Every structure is written in C-alpha cells, then in structure tokens.
Amino acid sequence: DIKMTQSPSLMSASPGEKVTMTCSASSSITYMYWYQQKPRSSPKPWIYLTSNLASGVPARFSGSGSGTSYSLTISSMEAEDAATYYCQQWSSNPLTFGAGTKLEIK
Amino acid sequence: DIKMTQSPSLMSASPGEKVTMTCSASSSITYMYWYQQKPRSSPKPWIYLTSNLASGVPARFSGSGSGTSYSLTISSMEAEDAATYYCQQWSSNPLTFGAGTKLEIKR
Amino acid sequence: DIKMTQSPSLMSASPGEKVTMTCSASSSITYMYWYQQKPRSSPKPWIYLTSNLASGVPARFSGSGSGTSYSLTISSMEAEDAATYYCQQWSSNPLTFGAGTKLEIK
Amino acid sequence: NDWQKNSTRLWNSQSSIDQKLANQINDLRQTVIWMGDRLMSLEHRFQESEHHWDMVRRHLQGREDNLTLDISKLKEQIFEASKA
Amino acid sequence: NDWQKNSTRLWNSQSSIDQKLANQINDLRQTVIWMGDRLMSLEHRFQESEHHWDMVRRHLQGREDNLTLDISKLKEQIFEASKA
Amino acid sequence: NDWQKNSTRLWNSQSSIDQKLANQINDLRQTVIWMGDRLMSLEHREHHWDMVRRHLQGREDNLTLDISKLKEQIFEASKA
Amino acid sequence: DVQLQESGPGLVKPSQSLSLTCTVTGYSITSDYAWNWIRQFPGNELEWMGYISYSGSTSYNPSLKSRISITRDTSKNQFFLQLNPVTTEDTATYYCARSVILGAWFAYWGQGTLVTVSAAS
Amino acid sequence: DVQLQESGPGLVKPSQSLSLTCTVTGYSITSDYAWNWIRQFPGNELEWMGYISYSGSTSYNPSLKSRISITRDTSKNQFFLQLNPVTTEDTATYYCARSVILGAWFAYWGQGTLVTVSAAS
Amino acid sequence: DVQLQESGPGLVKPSQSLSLTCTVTGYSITSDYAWNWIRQFPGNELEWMGYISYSGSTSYNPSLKSRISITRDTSKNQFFLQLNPVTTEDTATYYCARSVILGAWFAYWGQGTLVTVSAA
C-alpha cells in the first residue's frame, strides 16, 4: 500500500498568519483529497482533486502540489480553522489516509 | 493461438454420482464458456463466465476455476446429462474451442 | 514532435498521367490526413483516415498506406489539381503537418 | 559491474509504467459501467434490449485476465535479480 | 551465465502484461462504440444532427498504431536473445 | 559484448509499446467525456456528472513524463 | 424469439466457391448483436470462422483471412458466408450463431447443415 | 438533503460478530453513488474498510478482506457491515460515507458511532 | 453551414501582445467540436498552435504553452487567441479551424488573416 506522510504532526500559529501543510506520498498517486476533523465530529470534505474547494469552504483555503508532494495552505489563519487535517490518496485498492496534522491557535 | 486442452477425453459414470471436467489453457485467457452437444444437434449454451448458468440449465451444474484451469461439475448426474462438453475461451482474435469431453452412462 | 517528410518536394506532371506522392513519418502514428492548398486560399480538407475522400472530392484521388509510409495517388491528372498537398499525423500532442508536395502542371 | 544498476533502474521504471496503465483502464471501465447504466435507466424511462445490456455488463465486471497479481510477480522477479 | 535466465524470465513476464493491457482496451472500445450507437439511436427515437458521431465512430475503428504485431515482434526478439 | 546490443534493442521496442498504450487510453478517455455530455444533454430534454467529468480530466498519474524519462535511462545505458 | 435457419448446397467440388445463407426470424440483424459462422469437423472439434456485426463491420479468423468473406442482405434479414477456394479438408458441419458484442457467448445456434467436399459423383 | 445515521452495539466481546446499520434518508441507495464504511482508531488514524455500490457490487480492504462483508436492504434503504471475528484492535469509531462512483470523494459522512471491543463489563 | 471569419491587426511591433478574433456563424461554439488556431509561415509550413474545446478545456502546443492562451465569448459566439511575447518569427498567416473531437480532422477553415511582426 501507499504510505501517506504528513509534516509536521503538530503545528501552532497565532491568528492572522500564513500556514502551510505538506502531505508526501511514498509513490505515485492519482487523486488527492483533503479533510478536517474538529474534535468529536466526523471529517468534513473540503478539497478534491488537490485544487477545488468544496461548497462552504471560504476562499482563504487553497491546495497545490504534483507528483508525490501536495500542499494545503491558509492565506490568513482565522479562529475556527484549528483542527486536524487529513490527506487522502486514491490510486488503487485500497485508499490510504494521512496521519493527521493538528493545527493550533496561539 | 491458445490451445485449450480438455481432459479426460472420454469418461464414464453411473447416475447419481459426482463428475468433474477439466479444461486447462495454454496461456492466460479472459472469458470462459461451456457448451453441451448431444448427438445430431447444435451445441447449446450451458455456462458463461465460468460461474453463471444459462437459462434452463439444471441447478446441479456448476462451474469454477481461475487462471488457466477450469472445472465443470454436476452434483448428481442423471441419465439426460450424457453429452459431449466443449470449453471455449475468448481472449483475443480468434476464439478457440476445446477438444471435447464426451461423458457417458454406465448401465 | 514526429517529423513528417514528403519526398516529392516539387513534382511537375502532365494531364492524364499517373501522379503519386509519399509522406513518411519518423515513428508510428495513429491517424493520417491530407489537405489541398491553392495560392491565396486556406487549406481544404481532402482525405481523412488515409482512405476516405472528403465531401466533394473527385473519385480520381486514392489514399493508401500503413505503418510509417503513406501515399496519395491521382489516376486521371487534371490541370485543376495543380496545388500543394500536405500530410498530417495525429499520435499525441502536438500534431505535425508535412513539408508540402507542390504539384505543378506542364 | 554497473549492469545490474542499469537493469534494475530500467526495470523499476518499467514496472511503474505497467501499474499506471492498469489503473487508468480500471478507472475507465468503472465509468463505462456507470455510463451504460445511466443510459439504460433513461431508455426505460422513455417507454427488450435490457437483457443485452445485462450480458455485456456482466462481461465487463467478469474479466479474468487479472492484470494485477502478476505485476506484483514482475516486481518480485526484479528484487532477487538485483542481488546478484 | 544465469544473466540469460534472469533476462529471459523478466522479458517473458513483461510481454504478458503488454498483451493483457492491449486486450482490455480493445474490449473497452467495442463497448464504447456499441454504447454510442445506442445513445445515437435513442436521440433519433426522440422526436437532426446525425454527424460527429459517425466521424468519431470512423476514428474509433480506424486506428493505425498496430499493437498486434509489434508485441509479436518483441516476443520474437526475446526468444532470439535467449539463445546467446 | 553482444549483450549491450540486445539489451538496447529490446528496451527500445518495449518503450514503443508503452507510448502506444498510453495514447490509446487517452483517446478513449476523451470519447467517454464527450459521450457523457451528449447523454447529459439528452437528460435535460443533474449533478454527479460534473464530479465524474472533473475526475476524468483531473488525473495526476502523469504517464507522459515517466515514459519520456524511461527513454533517456536506456540511452546512457547504451553508451556502456 | 430469434431463430436462425441456415441453408446451402450439400455437395461442392474442390476449388469451388461455397455460399451459405442464414435466414433470421423474429429479429433484425441490423438492430444489435453479432452474427457468427462456426463449423464442426468430422472429429467433432469446433472452429470459429468469423462474424459480421449489426453495423456491417466484419472480423475473420486469422487462418482464413485470404479466403472467407461474409456479406449480409438487410432488406430480407439474411447474412451470407462465402469461401471461394475449398479443399477436401472443409468437410464439416457449419452453424450460425448470435453472440454478444463484448464477449463470445453464442446464446443461439442454427439447426446445423453439412457440407462435404469431394469431386466424386 | 442526504443524511447518514449509523446505529449498532457499543460493546462487543472478542471473537464475536460485529453488526452495524446505516439508515439513509432523502436518497435511495440503489439510485446512484457508492456507500463506504470507514473507521478511526483511538490514535486518530483513519482506515477505509469497504463499500457496496448502488447495484450491489462490493470491494473490501485487502488487509481485512477475509473477515468483512457488506450487505444492504433496499426496501428499508439501509446497508449493513459485518466483521465476524474481532479482537481488541477493532476499538474504533465507525463512519458512513457516500462517495462519487469514479474516485474516492466522501462528500457526506455519518454522525459516527463508537465501538469498543473488550470482555469486562 | 458553418462559416468562420477571423480578424485581427495587421502589423505588430516586436515584444508586444498579439490579439486575434474568430467569429463563428450558423453554429454555437458551445454545442460541440473543438476550435483550433493554425498558422502558416512564409515558407508554406503549417504549424498547429492550440484549441479550446466546446466545454472550455484548452490544449496548447508544447512549444508555445509558456506564451499562448486561448479564451472565448459565448454570447457573441467568438473565440480569441492571445500571445504576450512575439518576435520576427511570428510573421505568418493564421487560420481558424473546427475539428472533430476525437481526432485532428480540420473539416472547416477560415479565410486566413496575415500578421506581420516588424517596426515600420
């Protein structure tokens, strides 16, 4: 299977800054997806095909990447953005999820 | 072309027994079919995709196998089941039939 | 970036003769097309899939070839056929046109 | 004595290509199966041939050539080939 | 030396995937060609632009990239090399 | 010394097959995308086709650079 | 209820053309499906000859490409088989078949007609 | 408009069958889309288990394909998960998901039920 | 039938943007087919530049992607060509074309406008 690695596992950032998230694949993948999970809730779909934000996601979020290196970035961190972010790839059976990079508010 | 060896060529059995037929391919194939031919008649569609049974085929019949070896089996043979059985594969042009296993009946 | 070469760069002919021209490719292609261009005019779709004549094309023209060797032949050469002919291939992005077989008359 | 490094690099690069080609074909056939079902559903809404669609549908899902499970064998064969 | 054996097994294995890949695409096109015909038939059943499906259909059936004898040519080359 | 000629000749033929296969899937992919739109148009006379359409043309498996990259790897291997 | 009904001359001389018809009842050979020709040698081994699809595109056995030719008559719902050069090795029982396009599943067959090749009378 | 809600037991002894349900409202699980089962371990790691298509075609994770099976009830509009042998490693939070048929885009999720595998009561 | 009537400026100074317009009559450019841009150099050499699909998808020549861009206007049934950097090698005769989606069959063509790059 494909091992999806996220760096760093835990990051903190005071509000208003710019943050970046990286999710590197062990080998080549076909599709890329991003989720968030606030505590005691189901993951919410945000980003599909590494660039398209799902409905309800504000424009401050954007995704990028190619090959075996994909990135999620926030132009300006806000209050409600502190949650664990999960990256998911789909190449063949089965699909693998990321380890989960947790964001923090300072 | 692919050579679909069929064994045994000529068997025999008594009613109510268990019978198996093997049809081994020379190389990898894509689809597997089985046909029944009684004397002086056209072959009838019997088994397609090596698991499904054609319309009006007794439930005793069953097909299995994967890779290059396939099997056709009747749970309890009745007298009406004595006929030559042909295995056909379809991977590329042209399709190839089997030599044919001619089941019989013991008195 | 397949290089398409047409051997008869400038091929004078006469009415009523057998006229042939060849378009060779560096490597294998998928589709072959032929176009006719007259002076001060846009190219005209002439042959598609190296055997089918376009609508309005006279029956005197024949297309043939396989692999990396294609030919356009004229059975009954008429002076009105004196125009440059181009061969086009489509294998992958981008498509490449031929050099051009200009066919005069005498 | 670099022949093994050249061969392993070429075979590793080649074996990756087979896997990528396999994935696109599987992705396409899944779309085609969904494509046909939506066509058949619309055809039935308009009002036979649905038996034909069922048979070709089972053929698409009932392939046996097993394009995977042998690419894995190919990746295996290279592995003990390198240690030589 | 054994290098002939390792090369022979790897090339014999690799040729198998190439044949399997080609067959899957050919089965796909026949479904696509057939499926468009049903889609085109349904449109005329609904009642003017019977074009760009024929020309696409001609393009589907008129490919000239072989993939029948080039694989066969490759298999012959491997067997010739195995005699070294 | 004949192994070098055989290895390069064999790898050149394999690369040709890889390009032909990749081209042939792409042509089918375009037809499937086009075919879905025609059926989608007939439906109106919604949704889940846009997501499939984006997925079809939104692959990140390349297959155009690796086959290219494979061609060089043979080339310096021929230099030996 | 598709019912294939084939017919043809029961005796042909060597190096002569063989023409077989196959009338189809209850279905149109242009609507859908493929239509095949299959023969059975006296040793009871089948061989597939070729088919013509509903749209008219045909495929032939690679070992008989220079010989076999299949043609259809849409108006009267028949498809024909032509084999211009023959030899005593073509003594077989020829069959019709309607099969699915994707695979080779001959779900219907003709009654079966015998063609023998010899110049003896 | 589409709501997924799972219900099931909360405590399951080792080596016992696990059963779950997913009641879908506002949509029919036979009309379109796939329907997945996803679990999250206490280490907040996510693992995909399997799905059943809108036509009944199912695929399973190869790491646990042996002991998993997914079925459905069309009339009641529910699809069920069964994991016949279980161990303490199956303590997780199980989720429903409806994804696009081509790729893996879980656009909808269930509330999320928690299953703990142990023997002490 | 389908008539393509392209237009654009005649002479372009080096190192400025070139704009071209193609007007389609009798057929909407969103219904189907691709819409290509082809140029012919003074040596009578044909080169394909790119196209915009009926759905907005665009494909560009690999030698021109860093400098070419194609847009369109649905309301007026026009699709445009754009080229930010130019040089004396861009002197050619540009053409419009409507091609079948699967292949490269340019079944229709425009009148043919000439663009020269110089500093007269």
Side-chain angles (χ1 to χ4, degrees), chain C residues 28-45:
Chain C
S28 64
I29 63 170
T30 302
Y31 297 138
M32 181 62 73
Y33 309 101
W34 290 89
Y35 298 81
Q36 180 178 354
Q37 183 176 2
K38 290 186 178 179
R40 298 193 333 279
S41 179
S42 52
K44 222 161 188 80

Side-chain angles (χ1 to χ4, degrees), chain C residues 29-31 33 48 50 70, chain E residues 55 58-59 62-65:
Chain C
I29 63 170
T30 302
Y31 297 138
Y33 309 101
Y48 62 101
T50 191
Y70 293 75
Chain E
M55 187 64 72
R58 267 75 168 268
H59 277 84
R63 301 196 44 110
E64 287 187 5
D65 47 0

